[PDB]
Amino acid sequence: AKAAAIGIDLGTTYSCVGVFQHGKVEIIANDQGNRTTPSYVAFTDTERLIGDAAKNQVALNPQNTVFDAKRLIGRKFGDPVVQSDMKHWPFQVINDGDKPKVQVSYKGETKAFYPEEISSMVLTKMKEIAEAYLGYPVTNAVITVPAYFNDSQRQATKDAGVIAGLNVLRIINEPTAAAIAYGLDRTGKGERNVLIFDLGGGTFDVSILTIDDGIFVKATAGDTHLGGEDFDNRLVNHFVEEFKRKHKKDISQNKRAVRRLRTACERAKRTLSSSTQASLEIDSLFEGIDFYTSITRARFEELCSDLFRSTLEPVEKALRDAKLDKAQIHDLVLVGGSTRIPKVQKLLQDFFNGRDLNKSINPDEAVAYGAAVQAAILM
Template identity: 75%
Template structure:
């Protein structure tokens, strides 16, 4: 199979999203119409709405308030993205206890119910709706050690949907000489039908697409075979093997040494994906012992229980050794990224290196901290900056500046610098505020979220009352339509009892009681239809 390069993911997403993205003070915001007015929402606000709904669902099921949460994210989410998740939690009224990657959470779910003896190399293949992650873990007696992670934040089920949408937009154009690509409603309806067809093709070899009045009163009826779907997405399917190869390479484990391959994420239901994985591992069948759609949530819930102090015996021996998903380092001469903690290093970890001055008699240095894999710092993500002053005047290269990176299990990075000659030092705890919401913005969004929640609750109550009235009215209408029929049945059954009485004047007491019971039972059945 031949693979080709993917499209530019960011531009592709902007083209296919069913909403408008605008630049507001250097930040992307979502522009929508709400109650007849144009409103701007940050991604954090949109996510907070999802979290509020999840919070309500959990509270309704548990019968108690929910204040804390654990959340899973793609493995390649950087520090800024993870901080944005925490901001969304604050807006939703949740305290985010910990953020885990999806495959790591799935590994917890797998390991909890699959306690094989000895050391196992397990690869987790997580293909979801919008992202793709691969992780390789060594699991032994409740200890989960992550050896390597890789992934693509712009590959998932939505990309497969986009291929189908484009295919059928062109088919509609060929058949009816009309272009629907600029009609948001038509494209949205087509996308829904394509997604449904994609799911159908996981269990059938052919799916029908039937959309009444798709565009300008034109009905669109067509079909899609599994073979055609696989052809349209062939390069995307093929590209999922690249992170698998990368993880094996980084962990220095041959594919023949992988004991189990665990599929996670709803897109792994696609038969072609399952075949590709099996073929890559020389015919080895993936492990299907956990539900791909629920695995990450299951694992995150287990971790939440551990963090909350749950003493259940089943989770007492679980111990997770995670890795740094991206390299962490500082900028050196020429804007070069010099990593101190390499990607896939087990955390917590601590690493020190000696650096020196670039100029003669340099008395201070600026230490810029970055994360990323690119050679030049401008292509990586700036986490923070601090200065070390009071360096003794000396020729360039003579001062000994020891820089230490201390990365803990919670993902907090502490960076310190010490002049070995003078003993002068400085340090910083990296909390990346670049691009983050300010305290004032979060407070405003919390207030607005409460307002939207109140409006949604009021609307839900209105709909509930409306549905009750509608149901009651239709029931009465049904009774009215059947009342003559019910009247006739009551007349017939009572006439029958009267006739029995006339013909059984000398009946025994128990016979009268039996006839009365029979009459009452029949009448009750008839009257129940009025309720």
């Protein structure tokens, strides 16, 4: 009775594990009952927190709560993009011979970690999630990366797996795994043109692939700084303005209040994908003032309409580079947690002239699903 291998979507903001068993993929829920886990690691006076536990105390402990390690893995400290990203992180990044390290306070001491060490802690959590479900230690894994990751980013992602005690069977591209989840290598219809529209929490990736006989990238486009976080921030700014009108106070320079507001906005945003209205409550938001309100789906769409519309531009750009008309895309695939937004789905569908789009696998799970299939094939 041999141990299964797992597929891990090691995401910028959330990660997800699957396993293929008994002819079927299982996307594995953690001990909160949740099938995605925040790619977050936190360091306190007493312990190391991973996932939800880390993301839950980010407002109280921002200096020692690490995230976005995927923006650093395999990178050089002197990279302009790295230096640009560092201005937005509340944690310290330092230079070790042109290699960035994240520096925090941990059990009273100053400790510094390589990006692949931070990511190895996320991968450890994903490994432990799989082990709790399967009932035995897991040693083999496929891990996914963006198609545009270079050799150094791939090697450092694999290193993060080895540090977590995994045999990395293979690093594969995220859009490949998404296509695998939809059986797009198995249509039996000859060569197919596939567009992957991947809108997550921090990044937007458009990939055009051809697939023929299990052989899979013709063009890419997107925005590494457009994602669900930006939709959260449109809501934040909206309620900052509402708070000024109701109480004549400006909370935007209170970092704890803004982060607490951001958390609540992200939850309301998720609710707005299933309901047309959502309520929001934060006790002692600012100067002990309770904040409580609601927002409609329509109002949220209006606050984000330019951002939503901007997603079509990389689609047009990728189609131009691939020298393909939109009608020559045989399979359209929507993945990433933000593609659950109904307005986003409708804009893509209208753009592709009413076409029914591949959405029955949960879009924040399809990459782990395809990684799990690849893993089983390699055992």
